[PDB]
Amino acid sequence: MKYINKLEEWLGGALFIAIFGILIAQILSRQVFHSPLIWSEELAKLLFVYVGMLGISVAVRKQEHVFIDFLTNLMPEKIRKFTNTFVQLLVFICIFLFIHFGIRTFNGASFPIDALGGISEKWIFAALPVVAILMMFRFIQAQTLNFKTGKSYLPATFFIISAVILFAILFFAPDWFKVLRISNYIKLGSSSVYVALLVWLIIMFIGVPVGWSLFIATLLYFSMTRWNVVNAATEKLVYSLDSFPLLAVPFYILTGILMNTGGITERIFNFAKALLGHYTGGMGHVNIGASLLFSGMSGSALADAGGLGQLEIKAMRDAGYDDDICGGITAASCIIGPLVPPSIAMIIYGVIANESIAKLFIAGFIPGVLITLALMAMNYRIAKKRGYPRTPKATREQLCSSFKQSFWAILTPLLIIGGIFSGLFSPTESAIVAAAYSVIIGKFVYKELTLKSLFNSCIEAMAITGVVALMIMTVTFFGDMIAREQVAMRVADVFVAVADSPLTVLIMINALLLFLGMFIDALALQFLVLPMLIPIAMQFNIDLIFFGVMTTLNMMVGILTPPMGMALFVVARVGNMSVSTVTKGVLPFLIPVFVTLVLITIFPQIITFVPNLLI
Amino acid sequence: MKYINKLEEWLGGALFIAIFGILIAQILSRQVFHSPLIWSEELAKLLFVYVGMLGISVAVRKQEHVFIDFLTNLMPEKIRKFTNTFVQLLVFICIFLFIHFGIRTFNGASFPIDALGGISEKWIFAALPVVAILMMFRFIQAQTLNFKTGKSYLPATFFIISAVILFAILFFAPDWFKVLRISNYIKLGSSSVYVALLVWLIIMFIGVPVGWSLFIATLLYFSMTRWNVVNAATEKLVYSLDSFPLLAVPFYILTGILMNTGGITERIFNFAKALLGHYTGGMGHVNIGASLLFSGMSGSALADAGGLGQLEIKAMRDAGYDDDICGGITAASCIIGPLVPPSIAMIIYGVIANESIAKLFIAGFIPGVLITLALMAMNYRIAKKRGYPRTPKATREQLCSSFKQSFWAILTPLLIIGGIFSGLFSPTESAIVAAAYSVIIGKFVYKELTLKSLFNSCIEAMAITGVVALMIMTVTFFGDMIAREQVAMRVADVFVAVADSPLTVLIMINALLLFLGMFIDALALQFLVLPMLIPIAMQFNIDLIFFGVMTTLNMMVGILTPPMGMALFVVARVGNMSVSTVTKGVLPFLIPVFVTLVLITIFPQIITFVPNLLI
Ligand code: NA
Ligand code: NA
Ligand code: NA
Ligand code: NA
C-alpha cells in the first residue's frame, strides 16, 4: 500500500506544529497582553491524544516497543521461533481487543467539552478506534517480513483470515464469546490477582513487550472474576493521554534533539575546555563540566554520552589519560542529565504518582550537584595518584572569545531553570519556551536549521513519544486492578515486624532495585516496578517526592552496572575500546554514586528542604 | 451514516480559512515588507482544487445542480416519473466514469510542482477520485429519498448492486467494456459531432443538469469515433480548477454575504434616503442610488433584489407610488450589480475565453453608469407625468449623521474600484482585501460578526461555488470536442454572404440571445451558449472584450423578460403583489435597457476606449 506509506509521519508532524503554535500563542497572549485564553489547553490536549495514537501506530509498524531481552538472548534459534510466534499471536489479540474497546467507548461518550464551545467528548474518544485499525493493518504488514525472514511460523494470510472471522463473529454473534470467560470453569477467588501477576511475569520474560503484557494481565484478571466490569475501567485508556503534564515530554525531546547538533556542542565544549582545562585532573573536569552544562537542556543520559564522547575522549586520551579511565569518566558523567531537571524519568514518575512535576524537579536538583562535586573529587584523586601532567594555562583572550561564541547556546539552561524555579512558568510552558528559543537560535544566530530539518526532528520526537505513550496508557489501566484488589495492604500485612522502621523498608527497596537494574534496562524497569511500589510506599507513610527522587537515582545507577548497562556499550562503541576496559574504568567511580545514594536515603531532609522553601 | 454527516462542510470550511490566511499573508508581505513569496499561489490553488471538489459533492448530495426546467413544468406526473428515473441513471453513469478517469489520471501524473519544493503533481491530481467516491455515496444516499416519495422507479439497492458489479468488471476484466464502442457497429464519420450535439440538446431539455449533459455529449462523441483519445483530454478536468483567476469567485461571494447583513443595509439605505429623497421622482432615485451603491460590493442581482426590496418598497408605497411602478423600479434596478464590477458573469466569461478579468471589469463600468442615468431619467418622467408629490427637504444635520453612520460601510466599493482600476491589486487580491476589510468592520466597528457566523458564511459560499465548479470543468472538457472538430469554421462557411458585415452578425446573435433569455435562466444560458459562440466570434474577427460585455448585458436583460424572469418572481414575493402587476410595471422601464444595448452594439468605441486608456 504505497500511497499510505507516510501518513502517520506527515499527519503527526502537522499536528505537532499546530500544537506548538497554539501553546506559543497562549503563552505570548497571557504574559504580554494580559489576555488569558480558555481554549488553548483543551485544544492542545485534544490534538496531543491523536499525536500519541499516531506515534504508537508508527512504533507498532517498525517493531520498536520496549521489551525485556535478558532470557531471550540465551535461547537457541529453534526455541526462539516458537516464542516469537507466540508473541505475535498475543499482540494480534491485544490490538483486536483495542479496536473493540475503542468502538464501545466512543459509542458510550456523552458529556460535552466545556471551555471549548460545548463540543461533545466524542471528538476526544474517536482517536482510539480510528488509529487502532491502522495499527492492525501495520501489524499485518510487518507479519509478511517476519515470516519471510524465517523468524515466525505464521504468514500474513493466516492473520487476515482470523481477523475477518473474528470481526464477523463480533458484528453478527457477539454472544458466542461468552465461552472465553474463565469464571465459567473454575472459581479461583482471591487468588485471581496472584495468578494474573504470575502469568504476567512469564509472558513478559519470554519476550512480550511490557506495554502489551500489562494489558494482557488486566484482561485475564477481569475474565477470571467478572467480565462486564471492564467497561467501567476502559475509559482510562483514553483519559490518560488527555493530560497536560504529560504534554511536556515531546517538547523536551525536541529541544534535546535540536540542541544536539554538531555546531552547538563544539562551542560548548570549546568553552568548557578553555575554562577548566589547566587544573590537576584537567580534561576530566572539562568532561564533567560539559556534561553538567548539557544536562540543563537534555532530558536523557545516553543522548549526552553519544553526542560528546567522540570529542571528549580525544582530548582526554591526548592529554595522557589511559583508555580505561577515560572510558570510565565518559560513562559515569552521563547520569547527570536524568537527574538535573528537566528529566523524562521524573515526568513519568509524577504522571504515575499524580505528583507535581515542579516539586520533583526542585527536589532532584541538589543530588545532581552533589554527584558532580563527588565525581570531580574522585577524578582529582585519581589524576594526582597516577602522576599525569598539567595542561598549559589558557590566556584571557581565548576565554573571552570562547565565551562570546558560546553565549547564546549556554544561555538556555539558565532560561529553563529560572523559568521553573521562580514559578514564572509551569513545566509545559517552560518546555515550549525552550523549544521556541532553540528554534530561533538555530535558524537565525547559527543558520544550522531549515524547515525540512525541523519537520524531520518533529517526526523523530513523535516517534520517540509513541513508545512511552503505550506504556502510560497500559500502566494506568493496570493500576485499576492493583488498587481494586488492595495488593499493597496484603503485602504490608505479610511484611510484619518491619513497620515503625521505615529505614529497613527503604534499604530493602533499594537492594531490590539495585539487584534488578543489573539485568533490566532502566526504561522498562521503571514501568515494571513503580505500579507495585508506589502503593506500598504510601502504605508505610513515606513521602512521595523523596521516594520519587530516590527511585530515579537508583534506576539511573542501573546503566552503569554489569552485565547489562547501556552506558557501557555506548561508551565502548564511541571510544572504540573493549567493554571490559570500560567496566574496569567505571568500577572506581561507582563509590561516589553509592555514597550519595546512602546519604540521601538516610537524610531525607537534604532532598525535602529546598522544595518547601521554594514552594 | 451519521458520523460523516458534516464532513464536506467542516473540511471545506477549514480549507477555506487556510486559503484566506495564506493569501492575506502573501499580500501583506509583498506590499508592506517588500518580501515576495513564491509558494503562496501554488498552495492556494492546490487547496482550492479540493475545496471545489467538496462543494461539488455537497451540491450532488442536496440535488442543487442547475438544469433547464421549462419543458419539465408542462409534463404530467406519470410522464415525469420516467424522465426522472432516466436522469438518475445518467448521473450514476457520469459519476462512475468520473471515478474511473480520476484513478487513471492520478496514476498518470508524473511532473513535479516547481516553486513548491519539487513536490509531485499527484497531490493535485488525487483530489478527483477521493472526492468522487464520496459523491457516489451521496448519490446512493439521495436515491433512498427519491424512491421513498414516489418520484423514481429505482431503489438504492439496485444502484448498490450495479455499482458492485461494475467495479468488479472494471477491476477484473476491463476488456469487456470494448463492446460499448459505438464505432464497432456504425461509422458515422463527420456527422458524429452533429449527432452528439443533437442528443446533448435532447437530454438537456428533459431535465438533465447542464454539467452532466456536457460530459455525456463529449463521451458519446469520443465513443462514436475513437475511444482511446479520451485519456489525453481527461487532464483538463483537473487542470481547469487549478486556476488563479477562478479563485476570486468564492471570496467575492463571501464579501457579498457578509455585507448583506441587516444592519449595514439599513445604514446605506438611510444615507441614500437622506441624500436623494427630496426630488421629483424621489424614492425612485433613492432606490436606484442604493442599488448602485450595493453593486460595488455585490456580484449578483438577485441578492440585491431580495436583500433590500422589503425596505425600499415600503418607502415608495408610502410616498404615494402605485404598486406596479414600485415593483417595476425594484425589479429593474437589480441588474446594475452584475454589470458594475465586481461581477461573477464577467469572471466566468473571462475564464472561458481566457481573457483578462481586469480589462473586462474596466470595460463593463461605463454601461453600468449609462443604465443608471437612463433609469433615473425615465423614473423622473413617469413621476412627473403621474403627478406624485415631493417629500420635504432634509436638513443638514440628518445628512451629516447619516453619513457619519454609513461611512465605513460605504467606503468598501471605493476600496475595490480603486484597487482594481489603479493596477495596485489583481482581481483576486482585491477580492481578498475586500473580504478582510468586511470581516474587520463586522467584527469590530459594527459588532455583528462571530466566529460561528463566519464559519457558516464560508460554508454557504463554498456550497454556492460548488455548483459553478462542475459546469466550469465540464465546459472546459466540452471545448476540446468543439475545437477539435472545427465546428465554428463549418458554421461560418455555411453562413456566407454575411461576412464583411459584422453588424449583421451582431444583430443575429443579439436576437438569438434575447429570444432564448425568455425561457432559460441566465446562469444556465451562459454555459449553454458561450462555448459555441466564442469560437464563432473569433472567426469573424470580433473583439472579445466588447463581445463579453455585450453578451453579459444581453443575458442580464433576460431576468426581466417573461415568461421566466427570476427578478419578477423575487420582486412579487418580497413586495407581496401579483406577478402580472410587476410585469406591467417593468414594461415601461425596458426601453432604456434596449436603447443602451443598441447604442453599445453600434458603437464599440464606447466600450473599448477606457480599457485601452487604463491598460
Ligand atoms: Na536533564
Ligand atoms: Na544495568
Ligand atoms: Na457587481
Ligand atoms: Na428571462
Residue numbers in the entry:
A (entry chain B), B (entry chain A): 1 to 615
Pull text from the paper.
Dimeric HiSiaQM exists either as a side-by-side parallel dimer where both monomers face the same way, or an antiparallel dimer where one monomer is rotated around the dimer interface 180° relative to the other. The maps are of high resolution (overall 2.99 Å for the antiparallel dimer and 3.36 Å for the parallel dimer, FSC = 0.143 criterion) with both extending to 2.2 Å at the core, allowing for accurate fitting of helices and (almost) all side chains. Density consistent with phospholipids is coloured grey and is particularly present in the dimer interface of the higher resolution antiparallel dimer map. At the Na1 site, coordination is achieved by the backbone carbonyls of S298, G337, V340, and P342 in a tetrahedral pattern, with a valence = 1, as determined by CheckMyMetal. The antiparallel dimer is hard to rationalise from a physiological standpoint. In the antiparallel structure, the inverted monomer displays the cytoplasmic face towards the periplasm and will not bind SiaP, which is required for transport.
Tripartite ATP-independent periplasmic (TRAP) transporters are secondary-active transporters that receive their substrates via a soluble-binding protein to move bioorganic acids across bacterial or archaeal cell membranes. The SiaPQM system from H. influenzae has fused Q- and M-subunits and is one of the best characterised TRAP systems to date, with key functional and biophysical studies informing a putative transport mechanism driven by a Na+ gradient. We determined the homodimeric (2QM) structure of HiSiaQM using single-particle cryo-electron microscopy, the first structure of a fused TRAP transporter at near atomic resolution (2.99 Å, with local resolution extending to ~2.2 Å), which reveals new details of the transport mechanism.
